[PDB]
Design a protein around this ligand. Structure first.
Ligand SMILES: O=C(O)[C@H](Cc1ccc(Cl)cc1)Cn1c(-c2ccc(Cl)s2)nc2ccc(-c3ccccc3-c3nnn[nH]3)cc2c1=O
Ligand SMILES: O=C(O)[C@H](Cc1ccc(Cl)cc1)Cn1c(-c2ccc(Cl)s2)nc2ccc(-c3ccccc3-c3nnn[nH]3)cc2c1=O
Ligand SMILES: O=C(O)[C@H](Cc1ccc(Cl)cc1)Cn1c(-c2ccc(Cl)s2)nc2ccc(-c3ccccc3-c3nnn[nH]3)cc2c1=O
Lengths: 216, 215
């Protein structure tokens, strides 16, 4: 019985997890909730044995999880990708948190009616945040060096989202532009992005001020 | 001796301080005051940090930023993250569910519309609290008989939501008892009555909620 990954039919909180599963060639099935399927979720929400019912959820023959970060880390942990010692695990959690500062920075203003205003403050800080990853990639192919880790897929998703908010945000960051193309050049990722399983849009929920709507 | 650098506020690092106090580990704090933002900007890129930010954690083995990497590093050095992928995922799920509450406060704490956003937040908060109340039905702490780092994160979230509404836990007796139980841990009690405890601010001095020099 393959694992089940449940979420809205958006990129949202789960997109890096989908990319990690595809990179690892892990079989999984999805429960997808469309824009008019809130009732289908409410009817299912307390029938999965989840201790903290929420979207996304991940169910296999061992665990029944919620919290997107617990889920992506669980998949990485099963593949010995979280780090071999406290120092390496901390480096990976620091990369993870620095990516979340960008991704959550988008989300925390995406549902406000006055998104346009708060977007200015976020975009004034975005370059300094991106510069830290540009520098990290100065002598590393991926965020943790020679091999892919789950924060690479988190960073890839963050770049995809911020490029919709500001199509020029990577004009000063050639290593980040190259990094994004490098992730797209991973055979598993390329196959996934060109597949029927890929959800291009929306980025946030359908009613969000930014990253919403049925189409870009 | 580790150095924990942060604003002289509870903020992102308060659960980390509580965990260090619970474990009785020595550490030095480099606290940045209300008018010291310039001093931080001037040194930010000279500390050997890969992702300069507040809080930072400097010890003989690592130079870290991101509050969750720091708290997990301290827990990891004490073998507290979980003994297998299933247990580690349970602990990460507990931490994420606490963060939904703590960050739900931070999301609205800087808005001029905090008073209106507070109504909506306190209306959604009981559903989040109920999951923790049920978790504590047959558990002393969030992961059973022994303390884990999400217990100090939950303690901090409860401390902060009680400043937003002192009666928001009255229908959640297991959460009220949990908060009291954490305060009854001798090393926590000692820390809370010490000169090292920072009671306020919660979000930074200019925040609409959890700001100002005193509560
Ligand atoms: O209330 C919540 O669940 C969140 C509150 C919240 C806002 C900001 C931040 Cl920093 C953290 C939490 C927002 N949210 C989310 C997502 C959050 C993050 C990311 Cl990334 S996505 N996904 C949604 C996904 C779907 C729906 C929804 C489903 C059916 C019909 C309409 C919607 C809808 N109505 N508003 N926008 N879309 C909602 C959310 C959503 O509110
Ligand atoms: O927390 C930090 O800022 C650093 C932590 C740290 C320790 C060791 C290492 Cl290998 C890297 C980072 C220490 N530090 C520094 C440094 C600059 C660059 C390196 Cl490398 S060490 N300069 C300082 C410059 C001035 C001040 C200061 C000046 C006047 C009055 C008070 C202080 C003050 N009140 N609290 N802590 N410092 C402090 C530092 C300092 O702590
Ligand atoms: O830009 C940022 O740093 C954050 C942006 C941000 C807002 C909301 C969310 Cl969901 C996530 C990120 C907010 N913030 C923070 C804290 C965030 C979380 C927690 Cl918990 S605390 N601590 C601060 C601590 C101190 C200061 C500050 C320092 C010197 C003088 C004034 C301030 C100040 N000015 N506004 N309120 N206080 C700022 C922040 C701060 O903005």
């Amino acid at each position: 019985m393959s694992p089940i990954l449940g979420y809205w039919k958006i990129k949202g909180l789960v997109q890096p997890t989908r990319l990690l599963l595809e990179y690892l060639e892990e079989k999984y099935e999805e429960h997808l909730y469309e824009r008019d399927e809130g009732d289908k979720w409410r009817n299912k929400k307390f029938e999965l044995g989840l201790e903290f019912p929420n979207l996304p959820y991940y169910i296999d023959g061992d665990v029944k999880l919620t919290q997107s970060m617990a889920i992506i880390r669980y998949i990485a942990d099963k593949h010995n990708m979280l780090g071999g010692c406290p120092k390496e695990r901390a480096e990976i959690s620091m990369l993870e948190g620095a990516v979340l500062d960008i991704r959550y920075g988008v989300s925390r203003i995406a549902y406000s009616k006055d998104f346009e205003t708060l977007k200015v403050d976020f975009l004034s800080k975005l370059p300094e945040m991106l510069k830290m990853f540009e520098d990290r990639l100065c002598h590393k192919t991926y965020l943790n060096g020679d091999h892919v880790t789950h924060p690479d897929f988190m960073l890839y998703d963050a770049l995809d989202v911020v490029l919709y908010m500001d199509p020029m945000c990577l004009d000063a960051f050639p290593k980040l532009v190259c990094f994004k193309k490098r992730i797209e050049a991973i055979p598993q990722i390329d196959k996934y992005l060109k597949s029927s399983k890929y959800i291009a849009w929306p980025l946030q929920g359908w009613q969000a001020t930014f990253g919403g709507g049925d189409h870009p």
